[PDB]
């Protein structure tokens, strides 16, 4: 199924996934499109933090729902 | 209900949904207009195009067409975001 | 004295030049000594006379002095919730 990954840069990313897939596989797909490693990636669904140990079905993430993308921001 | 939980980001979206689901043009578009009231001044990731844009694309009719643009212009009044 | 800059050059933001107080927003980010007056000037930059400033504090010193911006944004607003 398709989902939406909305950034805070006004940019919407679409990924073809399955409802039983883990979050880290989705972050691997984001790395496949972009080259950003998953430790630098954070995903938010309806104000809730996503953990890589669970699946999309565990958070009831379904076809073409909207995610949020915030990046790891460390300085110095 | 948006005045009741004001200046909030923690639980404002959660209180709307227990009275949102009624399948009404008047109850939802007042409750989803109240969602822009709760995050007014937070301007974090609540719905830049998430909830009230999903409200607005329902439109062929009354306040679904109307009561969705008032909340975002209220919540993002302090913004200057062009998108 | 340099701490009455942001609130009293909101006086000077609109009539003279919008960039002029933004060059004074630069003058905020110049006098970086150290945190105390630094904290209080930018308290007002969020929900006291304007917002639209939360893109100018993600510079190369994101530790605490340029991680004030998130605390400027919603954590002191959460302290205004803690009111």
Swiss-Prot record, chain A:
The record marks 54, 72 as: Interacts with activating enzyme. The modification ADP-ribosylglycine is found at residue 76. Transmembrane segments: none annotated. Changing residue 68 to G: Loss of DTX3L-mediated polyubiquitination of histone H3 and H4. Residues 1-76 form the Ubiquitin-like domain. Changing residue 65 to D: Phosphomimetic mutant that binds and activates PRKN. The chain holds residues 1 to 76 of 229 of the full protein. There is a cross-link at residues 6, 11, 27, 29, 33, 48, 63 (Glycyl lysine isopeptide (Lys-Gly) (interchain with G-Cter in ubiquitin)). Signal peptide: none annotated. The record marks 68 as: Essential for function. It comes from Homo sapiens (Human). This is Ubiquitin. There is a cross-link at residue 76 (Glycyl lysine isopeptide (Gly-Lys) (interchain with K-? in acceptor proteins)). Exists either covalently attached to another protein, or free (unanchored). When covalently bound, it is conjugated to target proteins via an isopeptide bond either as a monomer (monoubiquitin), a polymer linked via different Lys residues of the ubiquitin (polyubiquitin chains) or a linear polymer linked via the initiator Met of the ubiquitin (linear polyubiquitin chains). The gene is UBB. It is a peripheral membrane protein. The modification Phosphoserine is found at residue 65. Phosphorylated at Ser-65 by PINK1 during mitophagy. Phosphorylated ubiquitin specifically binds and activates parkin (PRKN), triggering mitophagy. Phosphorylation does not affect E1-mediated E2 charging of ubiquitin but affects discharging of E2 enzymes to form polyubiquitin chains. It also affects deubiquitination by deubiquitinase enzymes such as USP30. Mono-ADP-ribosylated at the C-terminus by PARP9, a component of the PPAR9-DTX3L complex. ADP-ribosylation requires processing by E1 and E2 enzymes and prevents ubiquitin conjugation to substrates such as histones. It is found in: Cytoplasm; Nucleus; Mitochondrion outer membrane. The modification (Microbial infection) ADP-ribosylthreonine is found at residue 66.
From Swiss-Prot, chain B:
PC repeats lie at residues 1-29, 30-66. It comes from the Eukaryota. Disulfide bonds: none annotated. Found in skeletal muscle, liver, heart, brain, kidney, pancreas, lung and placenta. Component of the 19S proteasome regulatory particle complex. The 26S proteasome consists of a 20S core particle (CP) and two 19S regulatory subunits (RP). The regulatory particle is made of a lid composed of 9 subunits, a base containing 6 ATPases and few additional components including PSMD2. Interacts with RPGRIP1L. Interacts with CRY1 in a KDM8-dependent manner. Belongs to the proteasome subunit S2 family. Component of the 26S proteasome, a multiprotein complex involved in the ATP-dependent degradation of ubiquitinated proteins. This complex plays a key role in the maintenance of protein homeostasis by removing misfolded or damaged proteins, which could impair cellular functions, and by removing proteins whose functions are no longer required. Therefore, the proteasome participates in numerous cellular processes, including cell cycle progression, apoptosis, or DNA damage repair. This is 26S proteasome non-ATPase regulatory subunit 2. It comes from Homo sapiens (Human). The gene is PSMD2. The chain holds residues 414 to 496 of 908 of the full protein.
Swiss-Prot record, chain C:
It comes from the Eukaryota. Found in skeletal muscle, liver, heart, brain, kidney, pancreas, lung and placenta. Component of the 19S proteasome regulatory particle complex. The 26S proteasome consists of a 20S core particle (CP) and two 19S regulatory subunits (RP). The regulatory particle is made of a lid composed of 9 subunits, a base containing 6 ATPases and few additional components including PSMD2. Interacts with RPGRIP1L. Interacts with CRY1 in a KDM8-dependent manner. Component of the 26S proteasome, a multiprotein complex involved in the ATP-dependent degradation of ubiquitinated proteins. This complex plays a key role in the maintenance of protein homeostasis by removing misfolded or damaged proteins, which could impair cellular functions, and by removing proteins whose functions are no longer required. Therefore, the proteasome participates in numerous cellular processes, including cell cycle progression, apoptosis, or DNA damage repair. Belongs to the proteasome subunit S2 family. This is 26S proteasome non-ATPase regulatory subunit 2. It comes from Homo sapiens (Human).
């Amino acid at each position: 199924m398709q989902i939406f990954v909305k950034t805070l840069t006004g940019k919407t990313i679409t990924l073809e996934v399955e409802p039983s897939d883990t979050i880290e596989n989705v972050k691997a797909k984001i790395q496949d499109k972009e080259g950003i490693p998953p430790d630098q990636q954070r995903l938010i669904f309806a104000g809730k933090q996503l953990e890589d140990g669970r699946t999309l079905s565990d958070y009831n993430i379904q076809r073409e729902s909207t995610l949020h993308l915030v990046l790891r921001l460390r300085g110095g | 209900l948006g005045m009741i939980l004001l200046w909030d980001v923690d639980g404002g979206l959660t209180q709307i949904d227990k009275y949102l689901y009624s399948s009404e043009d008047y109850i939802k578009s007042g409750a989803l207009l109240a969602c822009g009231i709760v995050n007014s001044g937070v301007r974090n990731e609540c719905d830049p195009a998430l909830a009230l844009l999903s409200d607005y694309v329902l439109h062929n009719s009354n306040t679904m067409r109307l009561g969705s643009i008032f909340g975002l212009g209220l919540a993002y009044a302090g913004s200057n975001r062009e998108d | 004295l340099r701490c009455a800059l942001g609130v009293f050059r909101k006086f000077s933001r609109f009539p003279e030049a919008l960039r002029l107080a933004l060059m004074l927003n630069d003058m905020e980010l110049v006098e970086d000594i150290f945190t105390s007056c630094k904290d209080v000037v930018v308290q007002k930059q969020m929900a006291f006379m304007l917002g639209r400033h939360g893109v100018f504090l993600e510079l190369s010193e994101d530790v605490e002095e340029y991680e004030d911006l998130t605390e400027i944004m919603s954590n002191v607003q959460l302290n205004s919730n803690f009111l």
